[PDB]
Scaffold this active site. Sequence first.
Site, PDB file in Angstrom:
ATOM      1  N   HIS A  82       1.185  -1.455  -0.395  1.00 28.74           N
ATOM      2  CA  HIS A  82       0.022  -0.548  -0.079  1.00 28.74           C
ATOM      3  C   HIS A  82       1.146   1.111   0.114  1.00 28.74           C
ATOM      4  O   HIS A  82       0.308   2.210   0.065  1.00 28.74           O
ATOM      5  CB  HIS A  82      -0.804   0.249   1.477  1.00 28.74           C
ATOM      6  CG  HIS A  82      -0.185   0.016   2.175  1.00 28.74           C
ATOM      7  ND1 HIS A  82       0.064  -0.726   3.712  1.00 28.74           N
ATOM      8  CD2 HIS A  82      -0.646   1.453   2.950  1.00 28.74           C
ATOM      9  CE1 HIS A  82       0.787  -0.313   4.786  1.00 28.74           C
ATOM     10  NE2 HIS A  82       0.867   1.167   4.841  1.00 28.74           N
TER      11      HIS A  82
ATOM     12  N   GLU B  39      -0.705  -7.717   1.011  1.00 30.46           N
ATOM     13  CA  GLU B  39       0.633  -6.497   1.257  1.00 30.46           C
ATOM     14  C   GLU B  39       2.199  -6.312   1.813  1.00 30.46           C
ATOM     15  O   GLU B  39       2.656  -5.664   1.784  1.00 30.46           O
ATOM     16  CB  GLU B  39      -0.265  -6.226   2.660  1.00 30.46           C
ATOM     17  CG  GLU B  39      -1.035  -5.078   2.884  1.00 30.46           C
ATOM     18  CD  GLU B  39      -1.365  -4.245   1.603  1.00 30.46           C
ATOM     19  OE1 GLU B  39      -1.869  -3.594   0.835  1.00 30.46           O
ATOM     20  OE2 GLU B  39      -0.663  -3.316   1.632  1.00 30.46           O
TER      21      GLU B  39
ATOM     22  N   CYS C  46       5.550   2.965   7.130  1.00 33.28           N
ATOM     23  CA  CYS C  46       5.555   1.705   6.459  1.00 33.28           C
ATOM     24  C   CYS C  46       6.545   0.950   5.520  1.00 33.28           C
ATOM     25  O   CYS C  46       6.983   1.763   4.685  1.00 33.28           O
ATOM     26  CB  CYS C  46       4.466   1.349   5.777  1.00 33.28           C
ATOM     27  SG  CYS C  46       2.634   1.108   6.936  1.00 33.28           S
TER      28      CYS C  46
HETATM   29  C1  LIG Z   1       2.201   2.255   7.521  1.00 30.67           C
HETATM   30  O1  LIG Z   1       1.067   2.786   6.351  1.00 30.67           O
HETATM   31  C2  LIG Z   1       1.086   2.421   9.119  1.00 30.67           C
HETATM   32  C3  LIG Z   1       1.750   2.183   9.895  1.00 30.67           C
HETATM   33  C4  LIG Z   1       1.074   2.833  11.027  1.00 30.67           C
HETATM   34  C5  LIG Z   1       1.834   2.181  12.430  1.00 30.67           C
HETATM   35  O2  LIG Z   1       2.011   1.635  12.284  1.00 30.67           O
HETATM   36  N1  LIG Z   1       1.278   3.363  13.852  1.00 30.67           N
HETATM   37  C6  LIG Z   1      -0.128   4.401  13.973  1.00 30.67           C
HETATM   38  C7  LIG Z   1      -1.056   3.873  14.583  1.00 30.67           C
HETATM   39  C8  LIG Z   1      -2.377   4.324  14.450  1.00 30.67           C
HETATM   40  N2  LIG Z   1      -3.335   4.185  13.581  1.00 30.67           N
HETATM   41  C9  LIG Z   1      -3.186   3.018  12.509  1.00 30.67           C
HETATM   42  C10 LIG Z   1      -4.177   2.053  12.016  1.00 30.67           C
HETATM   43  N3  LIG Z   1      -4.713   2.270  13.483  1.00 30.67           N
HETATM   44  N4  LIG Z   1      -3.629   2.763  15.093  1.00 30.67           N
HETATM   45  C11 LIG Z   1      -5.268   2.064  10.873  1.00 30.67           C
HETATM   46  C12 LIG Z   1      -4.689   0.475  10.960  1.00 30.67           C
HETATM   47  N5  LIG Z   1      -4.753  -0.380  12.423  1.00 30.67           N
HETATM   48  C13 LIG Z   1      -5.508  -1.313  12.272  1.00 30.67           C
HETATM   49  O3  LIG Z   1      -6.394  -0.980  12.136  1.00 30.67           O
HETATM   50  O4  LIG Z   1      -4.729  -2.660  13.206  1.00 30.67           O
HETATM   51  C14 LIG Z   1      -6.151  -2.899  14.324  1.00 30.67           C
HETATM   52  C15 LIG Z   1      -5.856  -5.064  13.718  1.00 30.67           C
HETATM   53  C16 LIG Z   1      -4.015  -4.737  14.082  1.00 30.67           C
HETATM   54  C17 LIG Z   1      -4.542  -6.255  14.162  1.00 30.67           C
HETATM   55  C18 LIG Z   1      -4.830  -7.735  13.365  1.00 30.67           C
HETATM   56  C19 LIG Z   1      -6.455  -7.075  13.135  1.00 30.67           C
HETATM   57  C20 LIG Z   1      -6.798  -5.458  13.294  1.00 30.67           C
HETATM   58  C21 LIG Z   1      -3.392   0.620  10.174  1.00 30.67           C
HETATM   59  O5  LIG Z   1      -2.117   0.218  10.868  1.00 30.67           O
HETATM   60  N6  LIG Z   1      -3.441   0.324   8.647  1.00 30.67           N
HETATM   61  C22 LIG Z   1      -2.045   0.819   8.234  1.00 30.67           C
HETATM   62  C23 LIG Z   1      -2.893   1.365   6.744  1.00 30.67           C
HETATM   63  C24 LIG Z   1      -3.208  -0.599   5.749  1.00 30.67           C
HETATM   64  C25 LIG Z   1      -4.080   0.328   4.677  1.00 30.67           C
HETATM   65  C26 LIG Z   1      -4.411  -1.573   4.054  1.00 30.67           C
HETATM   66  C27 LIG Z   1      -3.680  -2.727   4.030  1.00 30.67           C
HETATM   67  C28 LIG Z   1      -3.171  -2.622   5.553  1.00 30.67           C
HETATM   68  C29 LIG Z   1      -3.222  -2.112   6.980  1.00 30.67           C
HETATM   69  C30 LIG Z   1      -1.535   1.654   8.411  1.00 30.67           C
HETATM   70  O6  LIG Z   1      -1.618   2.654   8.885  1.00 30.67           O
HETATM   71  N7  LIG Z   1      -0.401   1.811   8.027  1.00 30.67           N
END
Ligand SMILES: *[C@@H](O)[C@@H]1CCC(=O)NCCCn2cc(nn2)C[C@H](NC(=O)OCc2ccccc2)C(=O)N[C@@H](CC2CCCCC2)C(=O)N1
Length: 165
Positions: free
Chosen positions: A31, A55, A131
């Site tokens: 992504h 991913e 990321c």
């Molecule tokens: C890089 O693109 C970025 C790294 C984020 C990071 O390290 N710290 C930010 C913390 C703030 N944050 C963002 C999110 N939550 N907190 C959204 C997503 N986290 C999430 O939903 O966790 C729930 C979960 C965890 C484990 C299993 C199941 C559910 C998140 O980190 N999203 C991510 C982007 C997505 C986009 C599509 C592909 C999957 C990653 C992101 O923000 N990464």
Amino acid sequence: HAPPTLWSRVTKFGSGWGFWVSPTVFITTTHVVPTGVKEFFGEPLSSIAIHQAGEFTQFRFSKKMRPDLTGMVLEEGCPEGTVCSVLIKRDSGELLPLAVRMGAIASMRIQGRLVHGQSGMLLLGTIPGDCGAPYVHKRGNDWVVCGVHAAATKSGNTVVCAVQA
Ligand SMILES: *[C@@H](O)[C@@H]1CCC(=O)NCCCn2cc(nn2)C[C@H](NC(=O)OCc2ccccc2)C(=O)N[C@@H](CC2CCCCC2)C(=O)N1
């Protein structure tokens, strides 16, 4: 302690980072790959082999892009309990190696997308810009890379790397 050459494999790419596994192989999180661009590292998309699942994205180039490097072992994640280091580079240039105790490899649904990932517990957290940063651990003499940073919980205590198919 990651040596300079190992840090020098971490490379700004798109909205995050990627990692030169070898002179020809670059890995990142899908992504962060920039959409609608026609060249990477000065090469046309035609010249790059691209493999992408869950991913995890791997680029294989037709020439040595980083001849200063040797090839290092890329694994599909690592054993549970392995303490990895996330080699984080910040936009400021700061190096931030974060220790992570890895858990299970699993399919995961993160903001609606399927991630083939491995979670870990941070043992200083990760931010939206991180990321693609590599998860590595030292196997005896050599460094092994086993995933690329993909996600973290809102807490920040739990991190997810995408891993090879
Ligand atoms: C890089 O693109 C970025 C790294 C984020 C990071 O390290 N710290 C930010 C913390 C703030 N944050 C963002 C999110 N939550 N907190 C959204 C997503 N986290 C999430 O939903 O966790 C729930 C979960 C965890 C484990 C299993 C199941 C559910 C998140 O980190 N999203 C991510 C982007 C997505 C986009 C599509 C592909 C999957 C990653 C992101 O923000 N990464």
